Structure 1
Amino acid sequence: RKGNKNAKLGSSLVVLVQKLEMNAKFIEERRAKVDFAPKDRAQVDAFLKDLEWEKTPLGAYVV
């Protein structure tokens, strides 16, 4: 939108990029407090072990 007129693909890509941005904002929100000292990676090796791939915004969109 300055190409073709393919609005269905336009809308689908807009929705996909929206979901990508939302999921990026989600991880960073839960990232803040994760001590990643170079000699201590316990928290990062745990990150979200206790979540399943329908909870993330991309998981919801993909399902």
Structure 2
Amino acid sequence: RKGNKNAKLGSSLVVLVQKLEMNAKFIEERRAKVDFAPKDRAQVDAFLKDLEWEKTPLGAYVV
């Protein structure tokens, strides 16, 4: 959109990229408070085992 006229693919990719950005942001807020010194990585090794693949915005998208 300065190509083709395939608005179906256009809309599908715009919603895809919006959801990818939302998931990246979601990772920002839940990772902003994690300590990752190079000799102590307990929090990052215990980061998100307790969350299942439907809570994430991209999980909702994919399901």
The CA distance in 2 between the partners of 1:24 and 1:5, in whole Å, is: 29
Q: How many residues align?
A: 63
The CA distance in 2 between the partners of 1:9 and 1:32, in whole Å, is: 34
Runs of at least 5 residues in structure 2 that lack an aligned partner in the other structure: none
Instruction: Return the offset for 1:10.
Output: 0.1
* CA offsets 1:1-59 (integer angstroms, 9 cap, x no match): 00000000000000000000000000110011100000000000011110000000000
TM-score by length of 1: 0.98
Where is the helix percentage greater, Structure 1 or Structure 2?
A: 2
TM-score by length of 2: 0.98
Q: Which runs of 4 or more aligned residues in structure 1 lie more than 4 Å from their structure 2 counterparts after TM superposition? A: none
The CA distance in 2 between the partners of 1:10 and 1:33, in whole Å, is: 36
Seq. identity, %: 100
Runs of at least 5 residues in structure 1 that lack an aligned partner in the other structure: none
